[PDB]
Structure formats: structure tokens, C-alpha cells
Amino acid sequence: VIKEFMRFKVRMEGSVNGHEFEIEGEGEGRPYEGTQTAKLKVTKGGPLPFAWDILSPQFSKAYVKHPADIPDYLKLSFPEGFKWERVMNFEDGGVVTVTQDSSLQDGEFIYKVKLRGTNFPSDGPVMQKKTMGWEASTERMYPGDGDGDGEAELKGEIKMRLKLKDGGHYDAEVKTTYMAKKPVQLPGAYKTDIKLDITSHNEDYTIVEQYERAEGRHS
Numbered sequence: 001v002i003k004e005f006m007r008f009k010v011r012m013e014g015s016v017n018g019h020e021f022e023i024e025g026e027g028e029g030r031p032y033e034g035t036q037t038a039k040l041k042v043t044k045g046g047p048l049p050f051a052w053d054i055l056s057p058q059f060s061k062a063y064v065k066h067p068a069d070i071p072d073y074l075k076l077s078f079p080e081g082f083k084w085e086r087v088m089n090f091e092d093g094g095v096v097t098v099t100q101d102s103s104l105q106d107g108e109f110i111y112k113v114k115l116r117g118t119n120f121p122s123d124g125p126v127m128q129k130k131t132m133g134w135e136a137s138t139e140r141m142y143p144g145d146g147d148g149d150g151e152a153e154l155k156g157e158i159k160m161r162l163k164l165k166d167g168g169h170y171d172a173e174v175k176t177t178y179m180a181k182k183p184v185q186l187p188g189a190y191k192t193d194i195k196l197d198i199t200s201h202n203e204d205y206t207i208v209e210q211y212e213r214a215e216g217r218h219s
């Protein structure tokens with residue numbers, strides 16, 4: 001059901017330091033090649049009073065290129081799909097939590113994202129929009145119980161680095177649990193290299209285009 005070219009649709013509802021917003025978007029890519037693009041539109045609460053960059057990694061792990069010796073747990077979860085839950089802890093105290101549901105309907109992926117950002121300094125780079133994109137990342141993937149029910153799924157850990165407009169970097173420690181909606185064979189531990197680029201945007205970031213490339217590899 002996962003073809004060499006696949007489209008997706010995404011909707012995010014969230015709040016950051018109490019500012020509520022909604023975003024709708026669409027994307028496409030080549031799931032076995034590790035490449036994908038997305039176009040997002042702020043449909044409620046725009047223009048956003050905070051950095052787009054804390055949202056961009058929440059908009060698609062079915063599009064990770066896996067070698068044949070790493071079981072592709074998230075591709076194998078379809079057509080039913082999978083869920084993921086994420087916490088990002090930023091170096092100045094900010095917190096982002098995310099829940100996500102991924103399904104396959106009428107030949108396209110459907111992504112539903114809920115996000116809450118809290119504990120951000122009012123004068124920090126996120127609330128003042130002083131960031132300018134993520135450095136490339138390596139996510140460490142391993143089997144483990146991430147939702148506390150005693151049963152293993154797939155976990156990921158990342159140290160992410162956000163570029164600052166004034167120079168230097170703003171770090172986040174990220175933990176994600178990925179849960180197939182049906183029993184799927186789990187891989188052993190491995191690593192995924194990821195780069196997410198903002199490829200275009202309008203003046204107030206109410207329309208944004210993104211490109212991501214991702215590939216798994218042995219440790």
C-alpha cells in the first residue's frame with residue numbers, strides 16, 4: 001500500500017505559551033528514497049507570535065530510506081498506521097509536547113498533530129522569532145516501551161540544534177515514542193540521519209514550504 005510515490009495531508013492544532021493556532025497542509029515524496037516536501041498554511045491564529053522552527057519537525061517517518069537489513073517498522077504498520085508522542089526540552093527551559101496519529105485513507109497518508117508549547121521565555125528566541133532553521137540531526141532509534149504499558153515499540157532520541165539569527169545555536173533534547181497500531185516486527189537499534197530545510201515562505205510565515213531527507217543506517 002506504500003507506493004514509490006505517496007502524498008499526505010496534515011492538520012495541526014496547538015498552542016504555544018497560550019497562543020492557539022491551526023495549520024493545514026499537504027505533502028508528497030518518495031518513501032523508499034527518503035525524500036519529501038510539504039506546504040503548510042496557517043488557517044487560524046496567524047500570523048504566529050513565535051518561531052516557525054519549533055513546528056517544522058512535527059509535520060513523517062514513513063518516508064525514511066531504510067537499508068534492507070533494518071526492518072522498516074513504520075512502513076510495515078500500514079495501512080492501519082502508527083502513532084507517535086514527542087517531548088522536546090529546550091536549553092532555556094521551553095517544552096514542546098506532541099501527539100500524532102498517522103493513517104492511510106484513499107491512497108494518501110493522513111496526519112493529525114496536536115501540539116503544546118510551554119515554559120518559553122517571553123524574550124527568548126522562540127517567542128521573539130529569532131531562529132533560522134535546524135542543523136542536520138542524527139536520531140538514535142531503539143526498541144523499548146515508551147508509553148509505559150510494558151510492551152515494546154520504537155523509541156528515538158535526538159539532540160537537535162536550532163540556528164539563532166544572532167549567531168550560534170539553541171539546543172533541544174528530543175524523545176519520541178513510535179507505536180504501530182498493529183503488531184509489527186521491531187528492529188534492533190540503529191541511527192537515522194535527517195535534514196529539514198525551509199525552502200520558501202511568505203512574509204509572515206503563514207504559508208511555508210519544507211523539504212526533508214532522512215536515511216537509516218547501522219550504528
Ligand SMILES: [Ca+2]
Pocket residue numbers: 144145146147148149150151152153
Ligand atoms: Ca508500550
